[PDB]
Structures are given as C-alpha cells and as structure tokens.
Amino acid sequence: LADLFPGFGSEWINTSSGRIFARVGGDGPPLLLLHGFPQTHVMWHRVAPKLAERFKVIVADLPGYGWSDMPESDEQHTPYTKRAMAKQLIEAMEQLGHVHFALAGHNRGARVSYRLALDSPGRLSKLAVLDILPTYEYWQRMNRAYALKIYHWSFLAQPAPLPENLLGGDPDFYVKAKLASWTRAGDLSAFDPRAVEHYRIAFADPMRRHVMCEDYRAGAYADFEHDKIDVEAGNKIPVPMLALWGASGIAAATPLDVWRKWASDVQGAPIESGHFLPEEAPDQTAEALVRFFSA
C-alpha cells in the first residue's frame, strides 16, 4: 500500500475506545480531516499537501475504519454512533494537545463532525461538512424516489448478518461499483488507483465490512434519534460552518438552505463534482477549505 502523504508522520493515538490511526503533517493551527464510507484517511491525499502549507493537518481513520481499532459493537451500535465517534476523536485530539481545533468531514466523517459540534461546540473553531445533509434530514425526505436513488442506507442497516453475508461473496465488486457510481462520470477515473487499492483492501476484511454495517445501523436508529432531539428542540450549531456539496453529489432545496435550519452561521457553495469532492475536485476543494479556515 502506497504512502500518499509525502513527509507526513504516522501516529497511532490511544483512546478509551481504541486506537485512532492518523497521518500528521504541516504546521500552524490544528485541522482534523475525517473521511467516510467506503473510504479511509487516504481520500484526503490530493488536498492535504495544500492544507499542510497553512495548517497542522491531522488525517484520521474513523473509529473502526482503515487502521483504527475496531471496538466490539452492541445492540444499539453504540461505538459506531456519531456521538460515540465524536467523543473518541475528541480524546484522540487531547492526546495531541488539541482542545480547540478546526474540522472538516466528508460523508460519515461529516456526520461525526456536525454531531461533535452539537454535543461539544467549544471543541471547534470552525467546521466544514462535505456533500451531506444531517442524518435526520436524509430520513425525513424519504419517499419512493429517494428510496430508489440511494438504497444503501436501508440495506446496510438490515439486522446482521444479512448485509455482511451478501457482501462476502465478491466484496471488491461492491466497493468499486459504489466508488464509481457516486462520481460525476460514473467510473473510477477520478481516483488515484493507489487510493482505490487502500479502499479495496479495507473492504476486503469482513471485520471492517461489519463496522461499516454497524455504522449504517447507527445511522438508521440512534444517530437519527440524536438528531431528532436537536431539531425538535430547535438546537442549532453556533460554530461558523461551511457546507460544500457536489452538483452531482448525494446531498429539492439546496443543501445550504437545509443547513441554515441546523446552524446559525453557515455559508456554502456547490462544486462541479460527484460525491467525492476531495478527489474529483481537489484544487477547488482545497481552495474553499483554506479560504474558509484562514478567514
């Protein structure tokens, strides 16, 4: 497996919940980057060099993903809830001496991020969320057309071992089809092939697949309940926020109008891209982030 981060160090950070793997580079204000599904930390490899010119950049594998440890799950999927993930990443950042930091997330990693902002706003200087709406909003909008367009939220959330058994026959085919499907073009041309191999090797481990299923089960149950509490209470994130989305991404109204309901100081823009902003549109995504976190 390639090293996609020239001159970044490598840390395995202890926490009460298990080790977090990270690459660490640059210097300046601390910025944590969180990937999602079906990826690992390496999906930031096109933008991290540019960010490292201005920030101390911490590129972490989510709890249970990549080279991070995999806690045993439970009947409420607790360790793979976004609440739990956020707590674990807070601990990992305190191990580095970072109690107040900037954060950018994509997909599951973005969900961790906004949940962190709702639970522990004082931890964050600023927050960016890439190509997502809140988990509550994804579920609320559910109807036939959404159910058919993006099916995997309900599929992976089926009780174990249904999705795990289905995914075990030909895992490579599933992971690669997902990666291609969510890009602008519908192919793998956006991705460095060495990055694709990181994703494929992760996905090839049944223990890593089970984590991804627990993640989505959390996404259907507890994470959705946690979000519902907030929206019904009228709680908004006070941390300055950026919402960046792909014009051909996954996230009627614009994602910016959705986020205004969840955040009292939010800006946003689309980028011409599928879901995978940092790989499909690296220059633009890096520029948007640098500008936001520096301003």
Add this chain to the structure above:
Amino acid sequence: LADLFPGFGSEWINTSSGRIFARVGGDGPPLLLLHGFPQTHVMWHRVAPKLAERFKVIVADLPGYGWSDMPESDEQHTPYTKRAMAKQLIEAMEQLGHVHFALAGHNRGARVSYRLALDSPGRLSKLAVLDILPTYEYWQRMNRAYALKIYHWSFLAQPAPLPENLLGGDPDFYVKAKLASWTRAGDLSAFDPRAVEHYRIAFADPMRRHVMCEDYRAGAYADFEHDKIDVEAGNKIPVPMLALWGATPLDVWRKWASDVQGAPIESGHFLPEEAPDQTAEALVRFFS
C-alpha cells in the same frame, strides 16, 4: 423434490410468451392460485386439497418462476410487469377453456391478481388477495420506517447487475432468511422442509433470481405508474373481493374496490403455510 399435491395432475400450458407450469386438481368451478416471492406454486400445498373438495384448482408458477418458462425481459421490465403477467395468465387459462374464474393470490401473485381485476374484470367471478396492499400504497407509505422494513423493494430494484451480483455469493442463506424473517415464529418451523427445498432450488438458479429482480424493478417503475393511473382516475375493482392479512388493510382496499370484505388471520406473511386451516376455511367460505 417431493410431490406435495396428491391427486393433482401436472401441466405445461402454452402461451404467446412461454409455458406456464401448473398442478391441476379437483372438479367444479375454476379457481386459479398464484404464489409470490421467494416461493413457487408449492406454497399452496396445505390449502389446495381442501379447495379441490369444491373447485377445479389450478396452481400455477408465475411467468418466469418455478418451472414456468422465462420470457426475455427488456429495459422497462415488461414481461415481469403485473399487467403483462396477468395478460399471460389470461392466455394460459383460455388454453383450458376458462374465461371466467375465481382467483386467489399471495405476495407478487396477489399483485398480478388485483392488476388482472383492474384491467380485465370480466375474467373474474371473485378475487382474494393475501397479505398485501396495492403497489402504489406501499410506495406512498415509503418513509423511514417502511424503507427499513421493506428494504428489498428498493434493493432488488437497483439496476442490474447489483442485486444479482450480491445474491450469487450465498443464495441459500438469503432465501432461507426471507422465508424465516417474515413468519410469526422468525424461523423455518412453519414450513414443510420439502417445500423449503423447492424454494431453495428455484432460488439457486441465477436466471430465476434475475427474473425476481426484474419483478421488483417492474414493482418500482411500470407497475407503480399503472397503479397511479387508476388511483388518479378513481378506478375501483368491481369484482367481489376478499382481503386476508396476517395479524387497516380493509380500509385501504375499500379505496381500491367497491365490494370488498376482509379478515385478519393469526399468522405472519405466509398465510397458507403458517395458518393453513384458517386460510383454507376463509377461502372456501368466500369462493362458495
């Protein structure tokens, strides 16, 4: 593979779209019984005898299921639309000289059945549907709770080859899990193991699984649009109808049908296997 229909013949019935396999038994007024997913005609083995006491009973594999031939599909999944399946079964019944008949269906076969009633009501003396609502109504209900409970409606409808690739790895586990998970008991104890083996064997064939996905693709697309035309027009089935359901559905069906009665049955989804005495008694009473 066991013979679960004592005193029934076995016929291959010709149609413009391919052969329909059926077990045929009994004498008297004609009654067609249609299975659904992931089963075959054999799921009626517990109730067909009692019905054959009073009716000529035709137990048919749906187009593409079981031993019925598999018509070639197309980009709109046409031969696995309920409209097209109902046309095909009308032609099969004509080959027997039955142009006015009673019909009971379960799951996918219940959808063929209410579609046949909406399109060609003169074909039917009476109609029974088991443990379904109309396709349009499921889709209208498709919020977070329904997306979770009826996830397969979206998963099996994904474009080929996604569900076919996933189902090939361990088909036996998937078929057995669907069978179990929709019963009251949550296991396979309600089924005859011989019946289970018929279902497993059909499901083990990639071409048979492809047909199932084509059925669910029709279920998400054309079948939905056919139904939506009827609900937007205010069309109600005029045929005398019974809705049985596993323990309202009757209130739903009264919006779709002008002469409908209904009752719950103590059962999970698979009424004719989980609750064979109660289902047979209800069907015999209605169809008599």
